[PDB]
UniProtKB/Swiss-Prot annotation:
Keyword Hydrolase: yes
Catalytic machinery residues: 164 (proton donor), 348 (nucleophile)
InterPro entries xrefs: Glyco_hydro_1, Glyco_hydro_1_AS, Glyco_hydro_1_beta-glucosidase, Glyco_hydro_1_N_CS, Glycoside_hydrolase_SF
Superkingdom: Bacteria
GO MF term set: beta-glucosidase activity
Record keywords: Carbohydrate metabolism, Cellulose degradation, Glycosidase, Hydrolase, Polysaccharide degradation
Annotated source species: Thermotoga maritima (strain ATCC 43589 / DSM 3109 / JCM 10099 / NBRC 100826 / MSB8)
Cystine pairs: none
Gene: bglA
GO BP terms, alphabetized: cellulose catabolic process
Protein name (database record): Beta-glucosidase A
Pathway(s) served: Glycan metabolism; cellulose degradation
Length: 443
């Protein structure tokens, strides 16, 4: 048996653009994911978020599923352009109404809301003014955060500024695979910097408006290992510093970017970037870490960053991501060791597999159970060695729009039949329900 501390928060997680559909309903402005997915060639099968899971209409039913499952926390995001259609200025009362109903329902049923302020659906109107590339986004984001705090902060007490800002910056503005679809290394590092400043400004407003709450920030993380005992160890050191929480937590805790990031990227950061560092050090209450995968890494003289991945013969998910459960232990231990934050949450962990509804009307995703079980086990371990892990969130409640992969990748513990919008709880969902009831594993 592996029992978790009393009060440990078992959660599920979603994001606004991935589940809601109806992106232009009730006076909402367009987002960058609306225009990105409506551009031919950007998303698999030309999928968009126009309908998605239709959560915009079926929100009550989805929450009832969370209730029925006994899950104690729900992490969801708010669509910035539903709230401020032009990004700043005018507030759309109908957008506030939609999240107000979700918030009140959750509290009625005793589910704890964890609100992600920004999960990638920037208002299109702000992208026209440069989006994350524009220093002024620190103001725009502050104003948006303030609206949320004032309207919801009486009831919501756990807040996340940014979801995966490395992805936002690098995959959105260097790789061009996500909105707004740009390929410019200098823009991508200005986005990194501005994301930090916007985060710090939001936290500052939070101290003024929600005096009894807690606020953090969420990072993607990979478990990187060297291909050989050789400068292979250093390329792993680079990937951890660049791709993992240190890119943002070295600034927040120590007032500068990590060493190896500066050696690679100093030419691409703003000239006097150090002038912003003391404001960036605004105290946070928790660190959220997402974790999915491990990667074997080698120095490579001819790669963009002097680094390439090498495929390993390990079990992979439908994403082709290698399943390495000890990565979640490693990253929890390392975060304590490097920055010692007062609280940590696993804000996302999960997997995509080729789910099908059997003749018996059930989704037998034993592979997802194996995945979840192995990772929850490893997180248990870190708790026993003193990591202040206060919660764990399965990505995702529902199969949903998986960004540039569209509907073809299913992460849910609940199946969605997109032709009817019927929800079918998967075996993994029933399994997790039992984990939550028992506050841990038992076999
Ligand atoms: O790729 C899986 C999952 N990981 C990271 C993102 O936060 C989420 O939106 C995405 O669907």
């Amino acid at each position: 048996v592996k029992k978790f501390p009393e009060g440990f928060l078992w959660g599920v997680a979603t994001a606004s653009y991935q589940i809601e559909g109806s992106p232009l309903a009730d006076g909402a402005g367009m987002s960058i994911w609306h225009t990105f997915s409506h551009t031919p060639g950007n998303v698999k099968n030309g999928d968009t978020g126009d309908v998605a899971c239709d959560h915009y209409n079926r929100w009550k039913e989805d929450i009832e599923i969370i209730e029925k499952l006994g899950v104690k926390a729900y992490r969801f995001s708010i669509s910035w352009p539903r709230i401020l259609p032009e990004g700043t200025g005018r507030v759309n009362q109908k957008g506030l109404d939609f999240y107000n109903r979700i918030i009140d329902t959750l509290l009625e049923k005793g589910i704890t809301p964890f609100v992600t302020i920004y999960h990638w659906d920037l208002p299109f109107a702000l992208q026209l003014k440069g989006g994350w590339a524009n220093r002024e986004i620190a103001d725009w984001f502050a104003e948006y955060s303030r609206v949320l705090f004032e309207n919801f902060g009486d009831r919501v007490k756990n807040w996340i500024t940014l979801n995966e800002p490395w992805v936002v910056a690098i995959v959105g503005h260097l790789y061009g695979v996500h909105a707004p679809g740009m390929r410019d290394i200098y823009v991508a590092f200005r986005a990194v910097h501005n994301l930090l400043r916007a985060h710090a400004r939001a936290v500052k407003v939070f101290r003024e408006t929600v005096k009894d709450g807690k606020i953090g920030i969420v990072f993607n993380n990979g478990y990187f290992e060297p291909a050989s005992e050789k400068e292979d160890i250093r390329a792993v050191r680079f990937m951890h510093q660049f791709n993992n929480y240190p890119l943002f937590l070295n600034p927040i805790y120590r007032g500068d970017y990590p060493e190896l990031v500066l050696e690679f990227a100093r030419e691409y950061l703003p000239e006097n970037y150090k002038d912003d560092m003391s404001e960036i050090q605004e105290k946070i209450d928790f660190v959220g870490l997402n974790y999915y995968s491990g990667h074997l890494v080698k120095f490579d003289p001819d790669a963009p960053a002097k680094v390439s991945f090498v495929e390993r013969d390990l079990p992979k998910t439908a994403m082709g991501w290698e399943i390495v459960p000890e990565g979640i232990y490693w990253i929890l231990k390392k975060v304590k060791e490097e920055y010692n934050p007062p609280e940590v949450y696993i804000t996302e962990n999960g997997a995509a597999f080729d789910d099908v509804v059997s003749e018996d009307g059930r989704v037998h995703d034993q592979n997802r159970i194996d995945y979840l079980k192995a990772h929850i086990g490893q997180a248990w371990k870190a708790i026993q060695e003193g990591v202040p892990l206060k919660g764990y969130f399965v990505w995702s409640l529902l199969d949903n729009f998986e960004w540039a992969e569209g509907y073809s990748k299913r992460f849910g513990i609940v199946y969605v039949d997109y032709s009817t919008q019927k929800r079918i709880v998967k075996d993994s969902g029933y399994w997790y329900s039992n984990v939550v009831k028992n506050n841990g594993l038992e076999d």
